[PDB]
Amino acid sequence: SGAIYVGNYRVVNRHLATHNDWANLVWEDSSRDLLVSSTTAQGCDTIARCDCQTGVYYCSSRRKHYPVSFSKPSLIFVEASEYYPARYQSHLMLAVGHSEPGDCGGILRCQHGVVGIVSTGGNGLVGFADVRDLLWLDE
């Protein structure tokens, strides 16, 4: 689990969105595993606006943060789960590192701020849903 709080927005994995997230829906994209809902309180997370390929992510299944190199956001084939059939997930970045399904929502951050959240994995590769292109999160 995990979320990003910026301005009057909450960014979560679409497959983990609650009834309250769907009742206050701003934007969602099944192909990216992202959903953004509105909040009453102001969030103070900083979103990165960059092309970094190195950062640190939080892994809840290890209670640890790991430094990784990661690919640029791209269209990657993702195997079926209980939440989606097999499909291409867009704006996804991979890194060599540990993750389990319950790690979704862990934040990946670079020197400039929040880059994305854990969304996919397996075989020693962790995948992050990028949020750096969502320029509207900041206004």
Ligand X SMILES: Cn1ncc2ccc(CN3C[C@H](C(N)=O)CCC3=O)cc21
Name the β-bridge partners of 129: 92, 117
Binding partner selected for residue 94 from Zn ion, ligand X, none, CB under the kind-specific 5 to 8 Å limit:
none
Cβ of residue 133: shortest distance to Zn ion, in angstroms? 13
Structure tokens at 97: 């590192």
- Percent helix, strand and coil across the chain, each to the nearest 5: 15, 55, 35
Query: Please, which of residues 14-73 interact with ligand X by CB under 6 A?
Result: 15, 33
Chosen residue from 115, 118, 134, 137 binding ligand X by CB under 6 A: 118
Judged by CB under 6 A, the residue of 81, 96, 124, 133 near ligand X is 81
136 Rama sector, left if φ>0, alpha if ψ -120 to 50, beta otherwise: alpha
Question: Per the residue annotation, which of 33, 45, 103, 130 is the catalytic one?
Answer: 33
Work out whether 131 is an interface residue with Zn ion (CB under 5 A).
Answer: no
52 sits near Zn ion (criterion: CB under 5 A) = yes
Two tokens, residue 1: 């689990």
Least Å distance, CB 55 to ligand X, is: 16
Helix (H, G, I), strand (E, B) or coil at 48: coil
Q: Measure Cα distances from 86 to 21, 50, 73, 80 in Å.
A: 25, 30, 19, 4
By CB under 5 A, what part of segment 101-130 binds Zn ion? 110, 112
Q: Please state the separation of Cα 45 from the chain's center in Å.
A: 14
Token reading at 67: 């430094």
Residues that bind ligand X (CB under 6 A): 15, 33, 78, 81, 83-84, 89, 99-101, 103-104, 118-122
Interacting residues with Zn ion (CB under 5 A): 48, 50, 52, 110, 112
